[PDB]
Design a protein around this nucleic acid. Sequence first.
DNA 1: CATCGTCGTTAACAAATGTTAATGCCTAC
DNA 2: GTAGGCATTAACATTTGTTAACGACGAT
Lengths: 236, 236
Amino acid sequence: NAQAEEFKKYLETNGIKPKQFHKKELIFNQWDPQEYCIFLYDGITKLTSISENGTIMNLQYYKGAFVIMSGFIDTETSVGYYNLEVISEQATAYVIKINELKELLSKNLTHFFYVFQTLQKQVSYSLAKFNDFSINGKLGSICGQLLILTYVYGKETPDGIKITLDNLTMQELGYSSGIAHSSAVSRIISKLKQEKVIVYKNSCFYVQNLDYLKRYAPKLDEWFYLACPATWGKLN
Amino acid sequence: NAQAEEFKKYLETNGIKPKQFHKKELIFNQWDPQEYCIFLYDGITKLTSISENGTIMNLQYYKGAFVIMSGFIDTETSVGYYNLEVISEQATAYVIKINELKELLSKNLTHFFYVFQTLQKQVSYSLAKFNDFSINGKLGSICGQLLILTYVYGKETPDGIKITLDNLTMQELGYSSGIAHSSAVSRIISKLKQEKVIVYKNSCFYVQNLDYLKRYAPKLDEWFYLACPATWGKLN
DNA sequence: CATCGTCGTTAACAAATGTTAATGCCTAC
DNA sequence: GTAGGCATTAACATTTGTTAACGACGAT
Ligand SMILES: N[C@@H](CCC(=O)N[C@@H](CS)C(=O)NCC(=O)O)C(=O)O
Ligand SMILES: N[C@@H](CCC(=O)N[C@@H](CS)C(=O)NCC(=O)O)C(=O)O
């Protein structure tokens, strides 16, 4: 965090210079037969998947310092067919071959447990996200996703809590949840304001009252408290 | 397997005990949050979370040689409040508390990479499970879970196919998906098979034609083709 | 010699959400 | 000036959440 910044210098040590991707660009696609380990240093990215007929799916987001792996370590094959798209205007990432990495992770066990940490922090995120999205309908999905964006991308302002995501398409939010229509999200989104909770001013969302989202997505909120204390501690 | 069981008695070299867990008991729980690493070597176990309204859901079934974490290795804190209840009559699980394991993997990297890889398989599993459940809702959710049971717990008669598990009852199969009402499951299962996409005869679940299940849970099928490809090969 | 439970099925009604369409506003170009 | 992206709302089809009745089956 820390841990990440030292990992960056460890990468620059082994002669791995960073590459600067711009918005809309794909760092890797669900068709590229080569697999990478990807150290996202700064910037915001999303992980998509496109069905045979074009029906896409926004799996989750990646922000700041984190690692995304397109392939297994020992076999160096593929773990799945997904795309890593850049949401931020400009994001820095270190692109390494899987063929190395385990060479680079044999090594010195400080950065070796680091990558492991991230991977252990992912299985926890996916579980909690899979929890709450299912126990309640596509409403529960929305509040859950919003709760995520609220903590990491949120900024405390006197009018409420604004998402710093500039911009945030409404067709995009449906993608992140299960909803596949711009209309159906809007049906829910001023069914999301309300009884109590958000607001959409000038052209960005503003969170006023978090517990309504909290009680609809309890495990993600509990996940944050556990795996991400600081980012959780900022708004409680 | 062959890469799991040489890691096996690296555990009781270093002296870690083979523990016997029978049906019903929980290798860890929600309300007495203790933090282990757990090497399941044989048996079938499920991962359950219970909310305060009393609604439960099955996040996943762990079976055979696999690893389950209830704690991070660096902070040694909890990853989330969950219960590892064992579906199986049998079970031999290896309990490794967290402060232990951290450099029982510093150890020697050859068995770390095994543990690392299991997590990689987990992440890609959760994502694929998340993709297929979300896009096509509950009907998709069921077809997904069915295809999972169809593969990993698979049987072949002149049947068509079959899931080895008994004590697979529709209120629990519903729990694996989002459904909390036994009748809502029957509605689907009954409907699902004037499509004749299984038989329920002999009080167990006899599917048909994987292609119907495959078409509704594509990412899950794909996952079995990229990870655990051997298991994908028996049922084609 | 069985029964009291389960558990699966079906129907019927409240609710959510999938789907297509019509609208008026926009910045991109 | 467009032409298209996006937000919003309406009206309707389908899916589901929910409860309950009925009835079969099997631990016991
Ligand atoms: N750098 C932060 C955030 C890393 C990160 O992007 N985590 C993912 C989950 S592994 C996340 O929070 N995604 C937010 C989302 O899905 O929108 C950290 O180390 O925890
Ligand atoms: N040990 C077996 C199975 C391990 C296992 O159970 N993996 C999980 C995915 S992380 C799974 O298949 N779950 C199936 C389910 O949830 O029913 C293997 O790896 O081939």
